[PDB]
Amino acid sequence: GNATPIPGYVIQSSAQVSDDSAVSKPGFPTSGWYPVSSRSTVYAGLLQNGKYADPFYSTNMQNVPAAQFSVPWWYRTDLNVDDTSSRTYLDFSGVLSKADVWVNGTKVATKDQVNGAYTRHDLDITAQVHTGVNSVAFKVYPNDPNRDLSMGWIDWAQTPPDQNMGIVRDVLVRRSGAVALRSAHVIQKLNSALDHADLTVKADVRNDSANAVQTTVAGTVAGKPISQTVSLAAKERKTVTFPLVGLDRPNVWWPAGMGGQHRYDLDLTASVGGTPSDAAKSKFGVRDVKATLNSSGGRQYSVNGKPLLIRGGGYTPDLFLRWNETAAADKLKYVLNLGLNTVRLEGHIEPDEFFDIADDLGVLTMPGWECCDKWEGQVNGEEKGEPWVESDYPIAKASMFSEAERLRDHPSVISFHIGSDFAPDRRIEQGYLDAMKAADFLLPVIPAASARPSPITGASGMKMNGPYDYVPPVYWYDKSQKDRGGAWSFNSATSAGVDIPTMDTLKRMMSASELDTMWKNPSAKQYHRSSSDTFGNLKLFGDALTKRYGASANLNDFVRKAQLSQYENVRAEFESHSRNYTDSTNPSTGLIYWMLNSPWTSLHWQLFDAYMDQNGAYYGAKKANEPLHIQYSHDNRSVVVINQTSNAVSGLTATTKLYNLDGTEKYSNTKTGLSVGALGAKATAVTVPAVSGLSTTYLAKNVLTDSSGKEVSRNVYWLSTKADTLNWGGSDWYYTPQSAFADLSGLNNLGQSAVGATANSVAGADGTTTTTVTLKNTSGGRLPAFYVDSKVVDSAGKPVLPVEWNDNAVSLWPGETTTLTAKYRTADLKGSKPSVRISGWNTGTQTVPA
Numbered sequence: 001g002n003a004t005p006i007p008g009y010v011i012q013s014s015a016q017v018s019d020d021s022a023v024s025k026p027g028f029p030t031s032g033w034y035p036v037s038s039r040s041t042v043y044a045g046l047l048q049n050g051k052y053a054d055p056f057y058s059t060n061m062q063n064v065p066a067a068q069f070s071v072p073w074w075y076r077t078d079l080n081v082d083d084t085s086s087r088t089y090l091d092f093s094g095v096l097s098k099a100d101v102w103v104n105g106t107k108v109a110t111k112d113q114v115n116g117a118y119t120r121h122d123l124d125i126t127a128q129v130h131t132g133v134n135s136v137a138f139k140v141y142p143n144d145p146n147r148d149l150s151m152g153w154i155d156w157a158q159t160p161p162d163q164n165m166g167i168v169r170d171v172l173v174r175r176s177g178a179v180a181l182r183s184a185h186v187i188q189k190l191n192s193a194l195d196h197a198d199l200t201v202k203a204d205v206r207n208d209s210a211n212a213v214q215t216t217v218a219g220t221v222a223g224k225p226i227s228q229t230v231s232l233a234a235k236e237r238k239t240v241t242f243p244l245v246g247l248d249r250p251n252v253w254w255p256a257g258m259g260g261q262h263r264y265d266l267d268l269t270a271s272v273g274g275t276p277s278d279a280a281k282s283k284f285g286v287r288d289v290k291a292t293l294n295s296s297g298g299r300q301y302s303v304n305g306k307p308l309l310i311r312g313g314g315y316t317p318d319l320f321l322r323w324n325e326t327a328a329a330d331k332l333k334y335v336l337n338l339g340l341n342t343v344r345l346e347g348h349i350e351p352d353e354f355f356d357i358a359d360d361l362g363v364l365t366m367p368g369w370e371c372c373d374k375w376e377g378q379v380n381g382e383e384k385g386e387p388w389v390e391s392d393y394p395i396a397k398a399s400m401f402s403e404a405e406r407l408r409d410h411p412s413v414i415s416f417h418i419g420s421d422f423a424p425d426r427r428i429e430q431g432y433l434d435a436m437k438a439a440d441f442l443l444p445v446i447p448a449a450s451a452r453p454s455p456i457t458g459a460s461g462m463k464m465n466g467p468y469d470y471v472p473p474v475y476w477y478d479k480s481q482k483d484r485g486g487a488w489s490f491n492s493a494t495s496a497g498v499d500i501p502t503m504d505t506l507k508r509m510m511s512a513s514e515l516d517t518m519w520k521n522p523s524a525k526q527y528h529r530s531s532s533d534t535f536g537n538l539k540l541f542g543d544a545l546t547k548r549y550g551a552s553a554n555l556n557d558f559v560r561k562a563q564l565s566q567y568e569n570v571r572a573e574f575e576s577h578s579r580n581y582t583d584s585t586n587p588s589t590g591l592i593y594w595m596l597n598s599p600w601t602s603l604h605w606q607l608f609d610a611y612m613d614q615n616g617a618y619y620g621a622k623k624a625n626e627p628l629h630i631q632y633s634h635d636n637r638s639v640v641v642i643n644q645t646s647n648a649v650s651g652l653t654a655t656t657k658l659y660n661l662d663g664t665e666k667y668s669n670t671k672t673g674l675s676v677g678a679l680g681a682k683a684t685a686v687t688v689p690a691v692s693g694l695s696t697t698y699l700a701k702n703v704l705t706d707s708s709g710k711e712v713s714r715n716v717y718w719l720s721t722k723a724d725t726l727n728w729g730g731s732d733w734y735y736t737p738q739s740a741f742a743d744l745s746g747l748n749n750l751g752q753s754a755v756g757a758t759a760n761s762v763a764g765a766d767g768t769t770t771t772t773v774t775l776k777n778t779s780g781g782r783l784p785a786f787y788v789d790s791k792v793v794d795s796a797g798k799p800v801l802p803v804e805w806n807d808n809a810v811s812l813w814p815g816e817t818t819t820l821t822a823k824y825r826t827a828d829l830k831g832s833k834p835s836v837r838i839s840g841w842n843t844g845t846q847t848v849p850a
């Protein structure tokens, strides 16, 4: 029942190996080979050893000769085997693109068989293994994402020099007796009342010995004993189906905030002759999911009978697929700190632990295949990936089986996208549906993330109409343009493009002169944006920032304006979709922000950056997604309350006030006694009238207080008397140009205010520190302290990351106080005492001890 991952390898180019058979012979010399940990691409392995500078900085990645990655590389290891009484297997996936496998001088599998990143291989190497020092070697072939059913980077970033060739998951060494236990899973079915489930346990047993056997498969499912005995001819595999097991009052798995995240255990041993032969432990969640088309044709998800608006971002791993379990948990925890409920994985489907963590945290996941490369090559015409040939078909089907087998018992998984872009043709789709059936993968299948239908499954109920680059806030509120990206249907991949990270991140990824060019000439190409010509520069963003904000006087000016613009836009993108969710006609049913994060240090399509720092786009998404929320509609000036939580709320007061930039209140409305339903329902407080005498740029302060008088949401907008308007006729696929621009340049002259800071920290016994900061607007006039950003820093003024704040980027009127809370690992302080750096738009910068 042993399954031990290979901890590491030594790697080298096949340019250095003239005899393949030699590598896997015990004693083969490996002087000058590179030691690498498990889950390394070739280039990630070279970085581990020195060998090139940090690709996260400037154009370092360009200085890597890529030619060396157009030939195979070897991954080699020794294995000590004390006792050959047990059978021996190599069980693995994640080979990019394909490999020959060698044990002790014998080629056990070729690249024609071991082919495709997602395919699983269970290689019986019993005949090759001997007592003592054994050796195993993979000759990994070059990866081309357009030719191979693998992973590529579309236009998200820049191309890794090795194109991710390597082994990016574990290779397991399995030991067992005559009988191998495989593919153990639990089919679970809950009644609609959610108080009774039925469990069908299924498990494969394979007799790899020379003789016929009886095997008993026995153990526990959800704490209940189970046992079946079957016969197996030599070399026979069987699927064992256990009689149905009833489960009363199951601990139902819920998305975060809707209840708990319990997973049950399955524990099984296959015995032969009254002796354990193999063993497997796994988990499953008791949870119903559905994804159906509503009367408007939009894809509508529900979990456990509760419909949900999907509010998420597109998730990506590291550009060089460097794996770290804590980092993965840190990234999914940020999902919840944002108030989001879902992540989409367009290809790049992460190792199991990622899904264990999403399960444990209650983050929903939307895995599927990616566009714009080999996956869609047979259906995507003149776009990138190659037409399919006969050998492609069984690789794609085996990839689907293997992913379906991996993914089926994770309750976070809410669907599989079998297409992205183009939906599969009938033959490809049929192979996917067959693979999923064979794996008992029973979750919703979505044909595409675009509007494109598949022949069998049908309409997607989703859209990808853009945009991916600058559009003003009001754009998201559009319902009139059926070929655009307004708040209706399921928005599976959309953003307003550029997302300048914090100054602290900027200074780590770009040179002074690259940064100088970024503010002075946004039209210039930026390596840390995209390899795509369409998204190669920041021109649309820079032009709108100038038009709407005012010209940038320096780098600092440009960055600070970038943050307001990103906060404003991302906030509107999300708020519009929350509002329109309960529309009678063409409701919004989903929004996946493009993207949650970036594969590397970037200037676009991120909420949190590669270092886990949090900028305007982050805080804006967090503001929009708070559980009891007040917001202002850019289209019609309606003030709207959203309740994200699982219970209806009552006796809410919504208070809306307009101020000129000199602090003069120009409008007040107090709406008491509001009720709002659960799980995304809304209430309208008031429609703000056109008010006379407003400054060109003015402020709207929205405050929601519960029946106890507690302030539960504060939302401040910087607004203009001059409207953003669209030139809909100038629209391209990725954006819509503006015919006129809001004037928010009044912010440039907003008078100075003051804060107002005290902080203290508590090192907990769970290895985390909580820093509490109390901020007060301490000025003696009428001016608000506007957009005040607090950052946990060490003694050198460097941000402590990752971090989670309850609230941030706050605005306080004179006399007003707010208390803020930041949590992080004590160890990420690295022995420094904590301080807090506090910067406001109109309050300057100070740091206080904590």
Ligand SMILES: N[C@H]1[C@H](Oc2ccc([N+](=O)[O-])cc2)O[C@H](CO)[C@@H](O)[C@@H]1O
Pocket (backbone or CB within 6 Å): 154, 155, 156, 346, 371, 420, 421, 450, 464, 465, 466, 468, 493, 733, 734
């Ligand atoms: N799935 C990709 C998405 O695919 C689309 C296909 C068609 C349209 N369209 O036709 O408006 C829009 C988007 O394009 C993004 C931006 O290039 C990529 O980053 C995503 O990975």
